[PDB]
Design an enzyme around this catalytic site. Structure first.
Site, PDB file in Angstrom:
ATOM      1  N   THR A  40       0.861  -1.144   0.000  1.00 20.09           N
ATOM      2  CA  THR A  40       0.000   0.000   0.000  1.00 20.09           C
ATOM      3  C   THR A  40       0.941   1.250   0.000  1.00 20.09           C
ATOM      4  O   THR A  40       0.359   2.339  -0.071  1.00 20.09           O
ATOM      5  CB  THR A  40      -1.008   0.266   1.166  1.00 20.09           C
ATOM      6  OG1 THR A  40      -0.065   0.574   2.284  1.00 20.09           O
ATOM      7  CG2 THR A  40      -1.990  -0.787   1.623  1.00 20.09           C
ATOM      8  N   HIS A  45       5.279   0.041   7.996  1.00 19.15           N
ATOM      9  CA  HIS A  45       5.369   1.066   9.067  1.00 19.15           C
ATOM     10  C   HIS A  45       5.150   0.390  10.420  1.00 19.15           C
ATOM     11  O   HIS A  45       4.840  -0.821  10.546  1.00 19.15           O
ATOM     12  CB  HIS A  45       4.555   2.327   8.862  1.00 19.15           C
ATOM     13  CG  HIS A  45       3.087   2.076   8.853  1.00 19.15           C
ATOM     14  ND1 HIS A  45       2.412   1.388   9.833  1.00 19.15           N
ATOM     15  CD2 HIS A  45       2.171   2.419   7.919  1.00 19.15           C
ATOM     16  CE1 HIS A  45       1.141   1.318   9.502  1.00 19.15           C
ATOM     17  NE2 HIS A  45       0.968   1.932   8.349  1.00 19.15           N
ATOM     18  N   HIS A  48       2.406  -2.143  11.265  1.00 25.04           N
ATOM     19  CA  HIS A  48       2.738  -3.476  10.883  1.00 25.04           C
ATOM     20  C   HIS A  48       3.638  -4.227  11.849  1.00 25.04           C
ATOM     21  O   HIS A  48       3.608  -5.481  11.666  1.00 25.04           O
ATOM     22  CB  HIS A  48       3.479  -3.509   9.514  1.00 25.04           C
ATOM     23  CG  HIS A  48       2.727  -2.726   8.489  1.00 25.04           C
ATOM     24  ND1 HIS A  48       3.079  -1.469   8.081  1.00 25.04           N
ATOM     25  CD2 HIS A  48       1.624  -3.062   7.783  1.00 25.04           C
ATOM     26  CE1 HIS A  48       2.223  -1.033   7.177  1.00 25.04           C
ATOM     27  NE2 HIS A  48       1.353  -1.983   6.984  1.00 25.04           N
ATOM     28  N   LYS A  82     -11.150   1.078   6.618  1.00 31.73           N
ATOM     29  CA  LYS A  82     -11.077   2.281   5.755  1.00 31.73           C
ATOM     30  C   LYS A  82     -12.533   2.715   5.599  1.00 31.73           C
ATOM     31  O   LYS A  82     -13.468   1.917   5.406  1.00 31.73           O
ATOM     32  CB  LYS A  82     -10.282   2.042   4.520  1.00 31.73           C
ATOM     33  CG  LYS A  82      -8.875   1.438   4.778  1.00 31.73           C
ATOM     34  CD  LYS A  82      -8.201   1.108   3.469  1.00 31.73           C
ATOM     35  CE  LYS A  82      -7.201  -0.046   3.562  1.00 31.73           C
ATOM     36  NZ  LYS A  82      -6.431  -0.017   2.268  1.00 31.73           N
ATOM     37  N   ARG A  86     -10.639   3.515  -1.851  1.00 29.98           N
ATOM     38  CA  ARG A  86      -9.285   3.975  -2.176  1.00 29.98           C
ATOM     39  C   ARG A  86      -9.160   4.081  -3.692  1.00 29.98           C
ATOM     40  O   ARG A  86     -10.103   3.727  -4.419  1.00 29.98           O
ATOM     41  CB  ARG A  86      -8.216   3.012  -1.648  1.00 29.98           C
ATOM     42  CG  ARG A  86      -7.877   3.041  -0.211  1.00 29.98           C
ATOM     43  CD  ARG A  86      -7.852   4.351   0.505  1.00 29.98           C
ATOM     44  NE  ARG A  86      -7.861   4.055   1.914  1.00 29.98           N
ATOM     45  CZ  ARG A  86      -7.547   4.697   2.999  1.00 29.98           C
ATOM     46  NH1 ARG A  86      -7.089   5.950   3.051  1.00 29.98           N
ATOM     47  NH2 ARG A  86      -7.677   4.047   4.175  1.00 29.98           N
ATOM     48  N   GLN A 173      -8.270 -13.131  -0.527  1.00 30.93           N
ATOM     49  CA  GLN A 173      -7.844 -13.227   0.855  1.00 30.93           C
ATOM     50  C   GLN A 173      -8.479 -14.591   1.238  1.00 30.93           C
ATOM     51  O   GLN A 173      -7.793 -15.557   1.638  1.00 30.93           O
ATOM     52  CB  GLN A 173      -8.188 -12.032   1.727  1.00 30.93           C
ATOM     53  CG  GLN A 173      -7.820 -11.832   3.125  1.00 30.93           C
ATOM     54  CD  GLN A 173      -7.315 -10.824   4.033  1.00 30.93           C
ATOM     55  OE1 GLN A 173      -7.210  -9.661   3.862  1.00 30.93           O
ATOM     56  NE2 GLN A 173      -6.854 -11.475   5.198  1.00 30.93           N
ATOM     57  N   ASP A 194      -8.965  -5.426  12.364  1.00 29.94           N
ATOM     58  CA  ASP A 194      -9.776  -5.163  11.184  1.00 29.94           C
ATOM     59  C   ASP A 194      -9.893  -6.254  10.157  1.00 29.94           C
ATOM     60  O   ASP A 194     -10.665  -6.140   9.177  1.00 29.94           O
ATOM     61  CB  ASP A 194      -9.138  -3.916  10.505  1.00 29.94           C
ATOM     62  CG  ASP A 194      -7.756  -4.300  10.024  1.00 29.94           C
ATOM     63  OD1 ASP A 194      -7.223  -3.723   9.073  1.00 29.94           O
ATOM     64  OD2 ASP A 194      -7.169  -5.222  10.598  1.00 29.94           O
ATOM     65  N   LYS A 228      -4.640   8.488  17.491  1.00 34.09           N
ATOM     66  CA  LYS A 228      -4.248   7.300  16.676  1.00 34.09           C
ATOM     67  C   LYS A 228      -2.742   7.020  16.748  1.00 34.09           C
ATOM     68  O   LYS A 228      -1.881   7.862  16.392  1.00 34.09           O
ATOM     69  CB  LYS A 228      -4.771   7.442  15.262  1.00 34.09           C
ATOM     70  N   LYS A 231       0.643   7.939  14.509  1.00 31.24           N
ATOM     71  CA  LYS A 231       0.348   9.164  13.750  1.00 31.24           C
ATOM     72  C   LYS A 231       0.940  10.384  14.437  1.00 31.24           C
ATOM     73  O   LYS A 231       0.354  11.008  15.344  1.00 31.24           O
ATOM     74  CB  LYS A 231      -1.151   9.250  13.493  1.00 31.24           C
ATOM     75  N   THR A 232       2.134  10.691  13.963  1.00 27.30           N
ATOM     76  CA  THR A 232       2.923  11.846  14.465  1.00 27.30           C
ATOM     77  C   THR A 232       2.521  13.070  13.669  1.00 27.30           C
ATOM     78  O   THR A 232       1.662  12.983  12.752  1.00 27.30           O
ATOM     79  CB  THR A 232       4.442  11.440  14.402  1.00 27.30           C
ATOM     80  OG1 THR A 232       4.650  10.652  15.633  1.00 27.30           O
ATOM     81  CG2 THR A 232       5.493  12.517  14.237  1.00 27.30           C
TER      82      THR A 232
HETATM   83  N1  LIG Z   1      -1.728  -0.317  14.388  1.00 24.00           N
HETATM   84  C1  LIG Z   1      -1.814  -1.575  13.952  1.00 24.00           C
HETATM   85  N2  LIG Z   1      -1.954  -2.575  14.867  1.00 24.00           N
HETATM   86  C2  LIG Z   1      -2.017  -3.873  14.447  1.00 24.00           C
HETATM   87  N3  LIG Z   1      -1.997  -4.320  13.241  1.00 24.00           N
HETATM   88  C3  LIG Z   1      -1.887  -3.312  12.334  1.00 24.00           C
HETATM   89  C4  LIG Z   1      -1.812  -1.976  12.592  1.00 24.00           C
HETATM   90  N4  LIG Z   1      -1.658  -1.252  11.418  1.00 24.00           N
HETATM   91  C5  LIG Z   1      -1.710  -2.190  10.467  1.00 24.00           C
HETATM   92  N5  LIG Z   1      -1.851  -3.444  10.947  1.00 24.00           N
HETATM   93  C6  LIG Z   1      -1.930  -4.722  10.299  1.00 24.00           C
HETATM   94  O1  LIG Z   1      -0.774  -5.076   9.615  1.00 24.00           O
HETATM   95  C7  LIG Z   1      -1.172  -5.964   8.528  1.00 24.00           C
HETATM   96  C8  LIG Z   1      -1.043  -5.041   7.286  1.00 24.00           C
HETATM   97  O2  LIG Z   1      -2.075  -5.457   6.407  1.00 24.00           O
HETATM   98  P1  LIG Z   1      -2.718  -4.458   5.384  1.00 24.00           P
HETATM   99  O3  LIG Z   1      -1.678  -3.893   4.497  1.00 24.00           O
HETATM  100  O4  LIG Z   1      -3.001  -3.167   6.018  1.00 24.00           O
HETATM  101  O5  LIG Z   1      -3.932  -5.192   4.756  1.00 24.00           O
HETATM  102  C9  LIG Z   1      -4.251  -6.459   5.369  1.00 24.00           C
HETATM  103  C10 LIG Z   1      -4.596  -7.538   4.378  1.00 24.00           C
HETATM  104  N6  LIG Z   1      -5.631  -7.017   3.453  1.00 24.00           N
HETATM  105  C11 LIG Z   1      -3.397  -8.021   3.567  1.00 24.00           C
HETATM  106  C12 LIG Z   1      -3.577  -9.339   3.106  1.00 24.00           C
HETATM  107  C13 LIG Z   1      -3.555  -9.656   1.731  1.00 24.00           C
HETATM  108  C14 LIG Z   1      -3.757 -10.975   1.306  1.00 24.00           C
HETATM  109  C15 LIG Z   1      -3.932 -11.986   2.244  1.00 24.00           C
HETATM  110  O6  LIG Z   1      -4.113 -13.284   1.908  1.00 24.00           O
HETATM  111  C16 LIG Z   1      -3.932 -11.677   3.603  1.00 24.00           C
HETATM  112  C17 LIG Z   1      -3.775 -10.355   4.027  1.00 24.00           C
HETATM  113  C18 LIG Z   1      -2.606  -6.399   8.851  1.00 24.00           C
HETATM  114  O7  LIG Z   1      -2.709  -7.553   9.643  1.00 24.00           O
HETATM  115  C19 LIG Z   1      -3.177  -5.215   9.648  1.00 24.00           C
HETATM  116  O8  LIG Z   1      -4.161  -5.696  10.595  1.00 24.00           O
END
Ligand SMILES: Nc1ncnc2c1ncn2[C@@H]1O[C@H](COP(=O)([O-])OC[C@@H](N)Cc2ccc(O)cc2)[C@@H](O)[C@H]1O
Ligand SMILES: Nc1ncnc2c1ncn2[C@@H]1O[C@H](COP(=O)([O-])OC[C@@H](N)Cc2ccc(O)cc2)[C@@H](O)[C@H]1O
EC number: 6.1.1.1
Lengths: 317, 317
Positions: A40, A45, A48, A82, A86, A173, A194, A228, A231-232
């Site tokens: 993305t 970050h 993740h 979201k 997007r 997914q 989420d 959040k 988020k700085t």
């Molecule tokens: N503050 C946070 N706290 C905890 N976790 C966070 C936080 N910010 C982001 N994440 C996580 O980090 C991962 C990033 O996933 P994503 O890019 O945002 O989309 C998720 C998915 N669509 C990608 C995917 C694609 C294909 C698939 O088969 C599985 C998954 C996810 O598990 C999401 O829950």
């Protein structure tokens, strides 16, 4: 058993499909789990890191992680968490970004362990070439519109509005979990809060095609002030040291509020309970010292960037 | 102009996207229209003749028809006018059936005319090889779930239940109209009553991709007794003379109720107005004669099967 208790204790378990079920298996077998990553951006970050560091933790108790790079799905876009639709990115951008993410991913995992080394995979490899017709019949046949419509990710958007494109994300997914189950013996899919809908979606696809596997979500990162996390005012805190320097990274952690610090040590570090409790006592007895704040910051900077970077940040501060 | 008035008069126009718009174009240009056929069996049936015969009528006033065989979509399944979810057929069955339908189709159209000869086409050729990703981004991006959910075909099924597979049917059909518009100059899509949603769906895809084209639906065939047309006690009345013999075909028509006969002559025959009115007067003045009933039966049997078959049926009766 105890790995699950630890996680519980650390506060890394928001929800689980069947805890007694999963706890059982975790203790009786070597469990293959995956976690999904969507390009993305050109860097992961600190949003993740919980999920990333959790995999590691699963690796350390001897389980095998598949970091999954989302070359196809990040070409679609996950509505989850979201409020708005997007923009669709170019294949070229996604392709570009996939390569970097793969690189940052690989740093947190152990590829030399024998019996439980990681794999980094790309759903573009099995999504890329599946024809539409095949997808709608093979995957679509299994899901009613009404199962789908009730998902938090979707229900949360219908008046807001949602492209059919985004509406179907969960199906992909869905499909991922099935290929990984079939070809890698993958039984657990973990993710952030989420992602629950998309995980279950995959368990629904597995049950319905086979008739065995679990889902665990990590809570999203909390702040006592109600703002959040990550988020700085400077913007996102990246994992790319060219995006966010080691010094900046370091300072971010060092500025943890007294309210957050014990939660973050639990989430992002490998300090023991005994150590974390110890720091809790010192935060009480001497909170101006900032003992928990420096331990967090050192520990995490080393993890992401390494000692030299750390040494620099400290010397720069 | 007058072709549209005729249709109107005959009672072949249930709805039209923009009548003044379409009437204009029909009178100023040679219009390319298509009509879609799904191999749902090894033969078309008399449910399909209004639409088929309408194309012909469009051909006769000098327009060009594309009979479309649905090799891909009949692999998916159209929820339209079905209260229940259907079974998915094998590619092999669909493939088999596609070949026959193409054959029955070709009998009603003029392939030797210069300037407006038919084409018989298969959406398998452009659906067959389109990758999922491409479909969701290229086609899916354009439709909100809520536009889709409001369709008669869908709205009519959500508590009833509907596979995502069937839910997306409209997208394909959507796509068809676009390829045909792009590659064949196709401006009108016509169909039976139940197809309105899928037609508009295609007009929504065209507008949104280009920013020109029309839709006309034919009413479903009426009975004064309130029973379902073409549904005999013997079963469906097919167009395959090995499924329904020419004699049986013939007798079906000959048994038209006094109540239906003038409507059917209008729908299924090429007799003029002046001729149809004439028969109306004789049905009034001498209804035991069964003049309208024999004219219908002769006219239609010749069309579907030819004189010799006709000669046989009559001699057999
Ligand atoms: N503050 C946070 N706290 C905890 N976790 C966070 C936080 N910010 C982001 N994440 C996580 O980090 C991962 C990033 O996933 P994503 O890019 O945002 O989309 C998720 C998915 N669509 C990608 C995917 C694609 C294909 C698939 O088969 C599985 C998954 C996810 O598990 C999401 O829950
Ligand atoms: N009693 C009747 N009166 C009038 N019309 C009748 C009657 N019985 C059937 N039909 C019609 O005959 C055609 C047969 O289409 P279908 O096989 O049933 O699916 C229709 C579509 N999904 C096929 C398709 C596929 C792809 C595509 O691009 C376009 C269309 C349709 O226009 C339908 O409206």
């Amino acid at each position: 058993m105890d790995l699950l208790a630890e996680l519980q204790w650390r506060g890394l378990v928001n929800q689980t499909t069947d805890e007694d079920g999963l706890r059982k298996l975790l203790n009786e077998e070597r469990v293959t789990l995956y976690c999904g990553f969507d390009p993305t951006a050109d860097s992961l970050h600190i949003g993740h890191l919980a999920t990333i560091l959790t995999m590691r933790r699963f690796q350390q108790a001897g389980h095998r992680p598949i970091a999954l790079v989302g070359g196809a799905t990040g070409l679609i876009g996950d509505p989850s968490g979201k409020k708005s639709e997007r923009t669709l990115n170019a294949k070229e951008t996604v392709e570009a970004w996939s390569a970097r993410i793969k690189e940052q991913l690989g740093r947190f995992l152990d590829f030399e362990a024998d019996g439980n080394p990681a794999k980094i995979k790309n759903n573009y490899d099995w999504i890329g070439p599946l024809d539409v017709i095949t997808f709608l019949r093979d995957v679509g046949k299994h899901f009613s519109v009404n199962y789908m419509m009730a998902k938090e990710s979707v229900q949360s958007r219908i008046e807001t509005g949602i492209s059919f494109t985004e509406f179907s994300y969960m199906m992909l997914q869905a499909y991922d979990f099935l290929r990984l189950y079939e070809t890698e013996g993958c039984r657990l899919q973990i993710g952030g809060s989420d992602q629950w809908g998309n995980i279950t979606a995959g368990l629904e696809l597995i049950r319905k095609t086979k008739g065995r596997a679990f889902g665990l979500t990590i809570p999203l990162v909390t702040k006592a002030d109600g703002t959040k996390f990550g988020k700085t005012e400077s913007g996102t805190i990246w994992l790319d040291k060219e995006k966010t320097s080691p010094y900046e990274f370091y300072q971010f952690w060092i500025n943890t509020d007294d309210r957050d610090v014990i939660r973050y040590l639990k989430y992002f570090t490998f300090l023991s309970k005994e150590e974390i409790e110890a720091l809790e006592q010192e935060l009480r007895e001497a909170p101006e010292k900032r003992a928990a704040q420096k331990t967090l910051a050192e520990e995490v900077t080393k993890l992401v960037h390494g000692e030299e970077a750390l040494r620099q940040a400290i010397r720069i501060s």
